[PDB]
Symmetry: C2
Subunit: 142 residues, 2 copies
Amino acid sequence: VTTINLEDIKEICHTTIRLGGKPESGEAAELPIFLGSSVEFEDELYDADGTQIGTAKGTSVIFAEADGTVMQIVSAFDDYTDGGRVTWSGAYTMFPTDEPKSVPAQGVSGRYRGLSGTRTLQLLERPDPGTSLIRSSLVLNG
Amino acid sequence: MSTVTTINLEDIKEICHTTIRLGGKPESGEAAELPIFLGSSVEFEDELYDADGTQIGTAKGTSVIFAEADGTVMQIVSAFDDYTDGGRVTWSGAYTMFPTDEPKSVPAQGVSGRYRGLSGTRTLQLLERPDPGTSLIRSSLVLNG
Ligand SMILES: CC[C@@H]1C[C@@]2(C)C=C(C)[C@@H](C)C[C@]23NC(=O)C(=C3O)C(=O)[C@@]2(C)[C@@H]3CCC[C@H](O)[C@H]3C=C[C@H]2C[C@H]1O
Ligand SMILES: CC[C@@H]1C[C@@]2(C)C=C(C)[C@@H](C)C[C@]23NC(=O)C(=C3O)C(=O)[C@@]2(C)[C@@H]3CCC[C@H](O)[C@H]3C=C[C@H]2C[C@H]1O
């Protein structure tokens, strides 16, 4: 029963933010629709030694669930240097913002294929609007 | 051996129950102190039938409306299927919202049962909105690996 367990990953996250809002022209303007704030992000993954273990790409949008709690929905994947890809996606409470956040993950290729689990992220520093610093962990089981 | 295994479910009749929220400006709490917008979202729970009429599973997920840099209105979905044979398939991704009647497709991953280790595409096409709470959808799931 194999367990992949990447801990204390250092994630440089390059963030392209759009606040969205009420659509003002196009097909969306004629509909009861609001454009959520979104972030397109492009990450580099490093182990403790400072070696690049992979990359990441995904997108996250803000919304609120049935009770009014502010949430975010993410869809993303990691391409790791040794071969495989791991997808991760789900919703998580937005606040507090320095809290560790987790969503289910699924290994799809390489040595991760057929394994599922959880990808975790936690904001450490936000030097500027285009860069976020995160410590991550990945736990996969099968 | 070096043999590809595939799953191909076509012409699924998917009855989808939608709980829709408008979104907009957050007017209370920590979120109201920031220039963020809550997207219009839908939380759905589906029943899946094959063409013969026998149920083959359920689905549950969330989708939120946003836009990309050029202003193309998009949705991002995160869902999973649970099938009657026991296995589980997650699917998630972004897709252009318009036209709303064209088939939309996002990546899918089999995670358990006969689907484990296979990845591909989950496709959904809206056929009717018989009431504000119900979608009738034609869907398909393709996985290989
Ligand atoms: C809820 C945790 C989140 C941290 C994390 C680390 C959590 C994730 C799951 C990863 C995808 C990476 C993320 N990194 C991020 O920069 C990020 C993230 O989604 C964001 O959304 C930011 C930039 C928003 C963009 C939308 C508009 C806001 O002005 C902005 C206000 C702070 C953060 C939110 C931050 O508090
Ligand atoms: C992209 C088109 C979409 C087709 C599909 C079939 C595509 C999907 C990937 C599935 C999740 C199933 C969905 N079915 C759905 O009812 C659904 C879906 O996202 C929706 O978003 C609805 C309810 C929105 C809710 C958010 C606010 C909008 O005012 C509303 C206006 C009609 C539909 C849009 C529908 O036309």
